[PDB]
Structure formats: C-alpha cells, structure tokens
Amino acid sequence: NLQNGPIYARVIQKRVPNAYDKTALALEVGELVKVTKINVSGQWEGECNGKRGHFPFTHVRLLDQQN
C-alpha cells in the first residue's frame, strides 16, 4: 500500500510553508511523513503527514522501521 508504504520518516522540526507556495508541505516537529520521491538536493517531495508537496528533508528524520 502507498498510504502506509514501507518508507517511514518522522519529523523533528516544525517549519511553516511559504505564503507563495501551493505545493508546499508543512512540517510539524514529531510527525509521521512518507514522501514519494527523494531528491538529491535534500528536498523530498511526496506524502507528508497526509499532505502533498515539497518539504526540506533537512528538517526531518527518515527510518526503515527496523530497530
């Protein structure tokens, strides 16, 4: 499934989206986000806390549900 795919990256920083940004993804420190396409510029775009757009992965943590 996509909604609850394998990718499990949580957030630790709360960053507000720009006013002039429609496809912007909001980030709330301490939340579950599952992007769709990881960029090489540190920007992951996809699914974030049930939202769609682009967010600075430089303010989030990624995990593979494996401890």
Swiss-Prot record:
Q: Which positions does the record annotate as the modified residue Phosphotyrosine?
A: 8
Q: What's this chain's function?
A: Involved in cell branching and adhesion mediated by BCAR1-CRK-RAPGEF1 signaling and activation of RAP1.
Query: How does the record comment on the protein's domains?
Result: The C-terminal SH3 domain function as a negative modulator for transformation and the N-terminal SH3 domain appears to function as a positive regulator for transformation. The SH2 domain mediates interaction with tyrosine phosphorylated proteins. Mediates interaction with SHB.
Q: Where are the transmembrane segments?
A: none
Task: Name the chain's protein.
Answer: Adapter molecule crk
Question: What is stated as this protein's family in its record?
Answer: Belongs to the CRK family.
Q: Give the shown range, full length included.
A: 232 to 298 of 304
- Record domain SH3: where: 4-65
| PTM per Swiss-Prot/TrEMBL | This leads finally to the down-regulation of the Crk signaling pathway. Isoform Crk-II: Phosphorylated by KIT. Proline isomerization at Pro-6 by PPIA acts as a switch between two conformations: an autoinhibitory conformation in the cis form, where the tandem SH3 domains interact intramolecularly, and an activated conformation in the trans form.
Assembly with partners or alone? Component of a complex comprised of SH2D3C, BCAR1/CAS, and CRK. Within the complex, interacts with SH2D3C (via C-terminus), and BCAR1/CAS. Found in a complex with ABL1, ABL2, CRK and UNC119; leading to the inhibition of CRK phosphorylation by ABL kinases. Interacts with ABL1, C3G, DOCK3, DOCK5, MAP4K1, MAPK8 and SOS via its first SH3 domain. Interacts (via SH2 domain) with BCAR1, CBL, CBLB, PXN, IRS4 and GAB1 upon stimulus-induced tyrosine phosphorylation. Interacts (via SH2 domain) with several tyrosine-phosphorylated growth factor receptors such as EGFR and INSR.
Site location (Proline switch)? 6
**Source species taxonomy:** Eukaryota, Metazoa, Chordata, Craniata, Vertebrata
The superkingdom listed in its UniProt entry is Eukaryota
Q: Where in the cell is it found?
A: Cytoplasm; Cell membrane
User: Which spans of this chain does the record mark as coiled coil?
Assistant: none
